[PDB]
Scaffold this active site. Structure first.
Site, PDB file in Angstrom:
ATOM      1  N   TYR B 156       0.853  -1.244   0.000  1.00  0.00           N
ATOM      2  CA  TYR B 156       0.000   0.000   0.000  1.00  0.00           C
ATOM      3  C   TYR B 156       0.857   1.250   0.000  1.00  0.00           C
ATOM      4  O   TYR B 156       0.503   2.312  -0.589  1.00  0.00           O
ATOM      5  CB  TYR B 156      -1.070   0.015   1.121  1.00  0.00           C
ATOM      6  CG  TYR B 156      -2.261   0.966   0.839  1.00  0.00           C
ATOM      7  CD1 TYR B 156      -3.197   0.664  -0.155  1.00  0.00           C
ATOM      8  CD2 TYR B 156      -2.453   2.137   1.592  1.00  0.00           C
ATOM      9  CE1 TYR B 156      -4.277   1.497  -0.411  1.00  0.00           C
ATOM     10  CE2 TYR B 156      -3.517   2.983   1.328  1.00  0.00           C
ATOM     11  CZ  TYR B 156      -4.422   2.663   0.324  1.00  0.00           C
ATOM     12  OH  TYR B 156      -5.493   3.495   0.040  1.00  0.00           O
ATOM     13  N   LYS B 163      -3.158   8.526   2.636  1.00  0.00           N
ATOM     14  CA  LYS B 163      -4.445   8.319   3.294  1.00  0.00           C
ATOM     15  C   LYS B 163      -4.404   8.874   4.749  1.00  0.00           C
ATOM     16  O   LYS B 163      -5.393   9.425   5.239  1.00  0.00           O
ATOM     17  CB  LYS B 163      -4.850   6.817   3.259  1.00  0.00           C
ATOM     18  CG  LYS B 163      -5.370   6.265   1.920  1.00  0.00           C
ATOM     19  CD  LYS B 163      -6.622   6.996   1.397  1.00  0.00           C
ATOM     20  CE  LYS B 163      -7.242   6.334   0.157  1.00  0.00           C
ATOM     21  NZ  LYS B 163      -8.300   7.161  -0.496  1.00  0.00           N
TER      22      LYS B 163
HETATM   23  C1  LIG Z   1      -6.534  -2.368  -0.956  1.00  0.00           C
HETATM   24  C2  LIG Z   1      -5.662  -1.759  -2.012  1.00  0.00           C
HETATM   25  C3  LIG Z   1      -6.002  -0.890  -3.028  1.00  0.00           C
HETATM   26  C4  LIG Z   1      -7.265  -0.109  -3.242  1.00  0.00           C
HETATM   27  N1  LIG Z   1      -7.260   1.114  -2.423  1.00  0.00           N
HETATM   28  C5  LIG Z   1      -7.898   0.912  -1.111  1.00  0.00           C
HETATM   29  C6  LIG Z   1      -6.706   2.344  -2.641  1.00  0.00           C
HETATM   30  O1  LIG Z   1      -6.768   3.194  -1.753  1.00  0.00           O
HETATM   31  C7  LIG Z   1      -6.049   2.739  -3.888  1.00  0.00           C
HETATM   32  C8  LIG Z   1      -5.636   1.995  -4.930  1.00  0.00           C
HETATM   33  C9  LIG Z   1      -4.962   2.507  -6.125  1.00  0.00           C
HETATM   34  C10 LIG Z   1      -4.381   3.788  -6.222  1.00  0.00           C
HETATM   35  N2  LIG Z   1      -3.737   4.219  -7.322  1.00  0.00           N
HETATM   36  C11 LIG Z   1      -3.658   3.396  -8.389  1.00  0.00           C
HETATM   37  C12 LIG Z   1      -4.211   2.100  -8.394  1.00  0.00           C
HETATM   38  C13 LIG Z   1      -4.877   1.659  -7.244  1.00  0.00           C
HETATM   39  C14 LIG Z   1      -4.097   1.282  -9.613  1.00  0.00           C
HETATM   40  C15 LIG Z   1      -3.510   1.799 -10.719  1.00  0.00           C
HETATM   41  C16 LIG Z   1      -2.916   3.142 -10.709  1.00  0.00           C
HETATM   42  O2  LIG Z   1      -2.349   3.639 -11.681  1.00  0.00           O
HETATM   43  N3  LIG Z   1      -3.008   3.828  -9.554  1.00  0.00           N
HETATM   44  O3  LIG Z   1      -4.914  -0.583  -3.812  1.00  0.00           O
HETATM   45  C17 LIG Z   1      -3.828  -1.232  -3.264  1.00  0.00           C
HETATM   46  C18 LIG Z   1      -2.501  -1.257  -3.724  1.00  0.00           C
HETATM   47  C19 LIG Z   1      -1.559  -2.027  -3.012  1.00  0.00           C
HETATM   48  C20 LIG Z   1      -1.947  -2.715  -1.843  1.00  0.00           C
HETATM   49  C21 LIG Z   1      -3.279  -2.653  -1.389  1.00  0.00           C
HETATM   50  C22 LIG Z   1      -4.250  -1.943  -2.118  1.00  0.00           C
END
Ligand SMILES: Cc1c(CN(C)C(=O)CCc2cnc3c(c2)CCC(=O)N3)oc2ccccc12
Ligand SMILES: Cc1c(CN(C)C(=O)CCc2cnc3c(c2)CCC(=O)N3)oc2ccccc12
Ligand SMILES: Cc1c(CN(C)C(=O)CCc2cnc3c(c2)CCC(=O)N3)oc2ccccc12
Ligand SMILES: Cc1c(CN(C)C(=O)CCc2cnc3c(c2)CCC(=O)N3)oc2ccccc12
Lengths: 258, 253, 253, 258
Positions: B156, B163
């Site tokens: 993350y 966050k």
């Molecule tokens: C859960 C989780 C999430 C979902 N989440 C809660 C999030 O807060 C954000 C996820 C996210 C933010 N930025 C990007 C991407 C995903 C994909 C592609 C891109 O270009 N940018 O994403 C993760 C990424 C790594 C580990 C855990 C998580």
């Protein structure tokens, strides 16, 4: 068509029209719940009956949470009226007065500590366990806590310890009961003026400080706590368990007074 | 009848029918809200216009939150339709991909840090400030956050930092806007597709959460509609978990 | 035979003999450490040199943490003096002045936010990354934070957000560095001149904190020394309050 | 020379050279403190006497914290030897076995709840209250807690509730004693292997998981917990109070296993 339609909710702690439980009852009834109430001691029965009738219910039961037999009979009696139970509101806490006036140590005795925890922390999971055999598969259990569990508030004292234990019991119960689909939450409410607070010397100042320092610049009401209660007890909150939710005009999240 | 009757709510961050903003949009509309939506660039104009139509809306606006001028023009165009705004939903979060894979340190750059914080944290109080002149006194602002803010979650990474900034802004925003009467909250939603490491998270949560299930956008949506409504008038400066209880245990032992 | 005997420790942010950094240096020096120092700006070189002599050191290096190449040069140069580095003190925090006075929204601009995060948050892991090739396996990284990361404090505003992200970077750095054996922590220090709002804080802390006094740079320095040493070898990913217990109370009622 | 030079510290809960109390005693003795020790039950007098001798002490006193008379007499005895007390180490905790195995509701009874909180939480502020008249103007009281206070851990159950109260008592104790210069903290120690843990059926699994997932990829040692304890007890920490400090290899700060 309310969001608690057809739900069967049992409420403890409704002592007056100032009670948090009174607020939650108004909000649950508005949303279509069917309600039942508990009371402490034989002589309190007409009073809970009048409150219950003003919420369209005649379902009222004795329960002193200090007594195992009353906890078992409570649910045994409820079961003759209700096949299953959808909601449970635990809104009870007590420590002998001297354990919440003045200094924490001056007011501490083994008996004071034992009573505060027995009544204010233990009772909640004991109610849950007693209720378990009749809970519906998506039931919701709610308890009332206060910020004193998290940070030291001046004469809150022995009640702070017992509220901290109760919040932990929110987490342990969530894990236990969640396997059965049952949700467990707390609302950490802001201070609310009741008859029992008249003997709390700093109460007026707490109210003043919260009104002046909370983000919303106002004390919370039993309508606000009530509505949050109703949400946590509803299917709208099925994603939510093990939570301590603040309903306190945001007070907990600031350092007030500087 | 419904609990958001006549409430006018703007949603950012809708990308697909599986978005959290989609779940919130569905729930708000069911409870009687009027909705508006943002999109990021002509590339997404058509998806978003089509989602708005599904919710009976024609108020769709460009807003790339890297761009101050687009933030301001958003509320200027919004003001031509709505005298006042009751609700804002912030569901935007981004970091470049390399900043959320592998090791935190090895993939960290100033640029990646800059962008993550800009898009994922700054943008919420920035919309809030640009919205303020048209905010009703009992408006409600909702952001979406994640447990990585609070505890270190593998991969993350920089998102966890951004966050945490996001959740602190929830608190400073609530203080700033509160005397007016405006409430500011987040939902710390559980995960909701198909990355390999995402799978492992979804499985661990399903296994280990108190309710032994992942959350849905329905559940997150309902909790959101609640915070956006007058039922939640006692609640502000809160990060509410909507995760199946997951935050609250030590799983996997 | 002091508890940091032989340990080689680099400190940033030493500005006056009233700096937290000055307290930590002094305690570190009393416990047998060898110290080095960064500074910003050729106007500051002789004062940091003078401070450094007061501590028996002649190792002072320029490092504007906004500048990637100075961060890399810092450790390229330090490396010509020390084979390996045991401690790092990160004691730099900056937001533009308007962003820490008055209303949170009033002092909020992208530039103010970007900068406060870049200097106050990003720079910590950034130094850690640049230092990694020369860190000993039992190295200890220490940052300074403040309670405004946790709860909204009246003028702290933008800086609240940057500290929250800083405290999260402590956790992610702990995971990223812990296999090698490096530890990463913060002290959340209470307040320690200028501001009138500050005297207000000082008085409030003094009246309301469990210990009814403000903390000193000696107290914060001793805590820093401890976390930098083998005594703390079990402690990582921690945000330790050194604040006379102030964080633990609802004061003023 | 040592950072605890001339400090006089009383330590409870030293059962064997595997106890946390043993780690703290050893660190403290290294840093120049003089020590005194409690023991429960006359059968153990001899063992604790050898431990004290190992730490260059002959000050051992009986103290069952279930018993008010014993708490009071401990300090009365201690006073005939020591003018004043600079440190107190509370390292005691107990719930009946069933309350810490299996499902939380399964081993929940009023008596199990009462025993857990009486011995594991109440006993801390009670020792502090009994100690108060001899505390020095910079005394430091230290208790041991565990992560189960904060989040639900699988068989931890009733003991999570007791540790949550104990952590709240750190805060109440810190306000109550703090004006007279007295500091109060907990160390939230990662799990440590003693003969008691074994078992405790899940203990090896916990240890493996903490080792694979903790930031430092290792379990904590009593030496690490002992050194941190030594620090909190010293003037090195005189800025530190009402703190729950993790000494657990960073384990608390992660989401492990994913
Ligand atoms: C859960 C989780 C999430 C979902 N989440 C809660 C999030 O807060 C954000 C996820 C996210 C933010 N930025 C990007 C991407 C995903 C994909 C592609 C891109 O270009 N940018 O994403 C993760 C990424 C790594 C580990 C855990 C998580
Ligand atoms: C707020 C606040 C409250 C209300 N509150 C949130 C509480 O959680 C409990 C208050 C309470 C518990 N037990 C008793 C009494 C009050 C009065 C008389 C009696 O015999 N027992 O009580 C306080 C007591 C001291 C300081 C703050 C508070
Ligand atoms: C306490 C306290 C402090 C000390 N502290 C913990 C801080 O973290 C201070 C940070 C800081 C950040 N940026 C700047 C300055 C100080 C001074 C001058 C300048 O131009 N920029 O600062 C506050 C700012 C507002 C409210 C409280 C505090
Ligand atoms: C870790 C861990 C521990 C260690 N720890 C931090 C504890 O706090 C243990 C407490 C404990 C309380 N009561 C009893 C026993 C131990 C042993 C034997 C007995 O009869 N009663 O105990 C656990 C119990 C369940 C789950 C995890 C743990």
């Amino acid at each position: 068509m309310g969001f608690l339609d057809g739900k069967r909710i049992l409420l403890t702690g409704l002592l007056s029209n100032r009670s948090i439980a009174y607020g939650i009852a108004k909000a649950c009834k508005r949303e279509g719940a069917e309600l039942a109430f508990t009371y402490v001691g034989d002589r309190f029965k007409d009073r809970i009956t009048e409150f219950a009738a003003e919420f369209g219910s005649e379902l009222v039961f004795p329960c002193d949470v200090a007594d195992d037999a009353q906890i078992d009979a409570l649910f045994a009696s409820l079961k003759t009226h209700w096949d299953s139970l959808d909601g449970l509101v635990h809104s009870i806490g007590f420590a002998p007065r001297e354990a919440i006036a003045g200094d924490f140590l001056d007011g501490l005795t083994r008996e004071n500590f034992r009573i505060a925890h027995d009544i204010s922390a233990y009772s909640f999971p004991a109610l849950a366990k007693a209720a378990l055999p009749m809970l519906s598969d998506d039931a919701s259990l709610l308890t009332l806590s206060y910020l004193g569990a998290e940070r030291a508030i001046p004469n809150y004292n022995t009640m702070g310890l017992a509220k901290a234990a109760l919040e932990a019991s929110v987490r342990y119960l969530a894990v236990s009961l969640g396997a059965k689909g049952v949700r467990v939450n707390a609302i950490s409410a802001g201070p609310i003026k009741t008859l029992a607070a008249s003997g709390i010397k700093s109460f007026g100042k707490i109210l003043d400080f919260v009104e002046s320092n909370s983000p919303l610049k106002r004390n919370v009401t039993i309508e606000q706590v009530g509505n949050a209660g109703a949400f946590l007890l509803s299917d709208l909150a099925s994603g939510v368990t093990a939570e301590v939710m603040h309903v306190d005009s945001g007070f907990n999240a600031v350092v007030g007074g500087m």
